[PDB]
Amino acid sequence: ALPSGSDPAFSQPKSVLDAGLTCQGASPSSVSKPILLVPGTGTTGPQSFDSNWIPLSAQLGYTPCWISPPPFMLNDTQVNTEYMVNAITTLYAGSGNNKLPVLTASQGGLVAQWGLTFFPSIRSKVDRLMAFAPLYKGTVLAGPLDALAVSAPSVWQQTTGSALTTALRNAGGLTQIVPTTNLYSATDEMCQPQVSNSPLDSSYLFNGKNVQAQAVCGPLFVIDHAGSLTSQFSYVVGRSALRSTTGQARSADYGITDCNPLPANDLTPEQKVAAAALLAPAAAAIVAGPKQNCEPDLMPYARPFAVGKRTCSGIVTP
């Protein structure tokens, strides 16, 4: 079974977590049809989504909301998840005690699934998860010892083999917990392996709607980790997932004629140009942020699932 019982303690003051949550044109505490947007490593909410799912979800009738855990999602993924759990608790009540969708970019999907695995209270408040290029198994690429002996906390945790990805898998987290759609690409340049269109892929969750773009669009279709979020093909799949009465994208709703890798048609020209410039700023933030030579310790609620892995304090024990 999954973790059950009481939610783990928060390490951050609630006022700090509240400060990281914003909704466009509304208060999180009094908001119609919120969608919670969870950014990837090296970005804020607006930086991840201003060129894409903030305007696109608004045009579908949601109030776009986001968390921006400081600094730029570079801190410990477990602390980033506190922002999401707090945001879910708030948006659920602030929308009349109604479940809400969560939509994530890159490592924001790891944040979401970590929260669902280890914070039982939110499972009944999230109606579906729409994850673009999620790194549930981390990635084998680049890495925390590349070009400097120190790397950001969440960069350590997103590395395949990390104590965090280990603990997520051993606790049951590579199976979907709420209805989940995972849109990803075999040509993802941040996250590998993604090529097999099978559970080997880092974005795959058992029983989820796992959509590798090349399985629909052809072996030669190319979108990177950002295009995975912003492309017109991505918009059609995400719109399906958000509208579906099953909580997952439906194969009937998308097909080879939607295989357009450029930014979603309904974005403004300015939004389309910004959608093409997402790589460099996130990479530079990763370079300028907090850095360390070890993976953050697992919090007690996750330690028993990665016994034997090495974190800053030493060997994980249960």
Q: Which residues are the active-site residues?
A: 106, 188, 225
Cis bond before residue 28 (omega within 30° of 0)? no
How far is the C-alpha of 184 from the C-alpha of 175, rounded, in Å? 17
Continuous H helices in 175-226: 213-217
How far is the C-alpha of 230 from the C-alpha of 91, rounded, in Å? 25
What tokens appear for 112 in the block? Answer: 């979401």
The DSSP-derived string for 124-151 is TTEEEEEEES--TT-BSSS-TTSSSS-B
Residue 139 and residue 202 in contact, taking contact as beta carbons nearer than 8 Å = yes
Q: In this structure, which amino acid lies at residue 302?
A: A
User: What DSSP designation does 202 have?
Assistant: T
Q: How far is CA 61 from CA 47, 58, 76, 235, in A?
A: 21, 5, 33, 15
Q: Which strands make up the sheet holding 209-212, listed edge to edge? A: 21-23, 63-67, 34-38, 100-105, 126-132, 180-184, 209-212
What tokens appear for 284 in the block? Answer: 């530079």
How far is the C-alpha of 28 from the C-alpha of 94, rounded, in Å? 6
* DSSP collapsed to 3 states, 80-128: HHHHHHHHHHHHHHHCCCCCEEEEEECHHHHHHHHHHHHCHHHCCCEEE
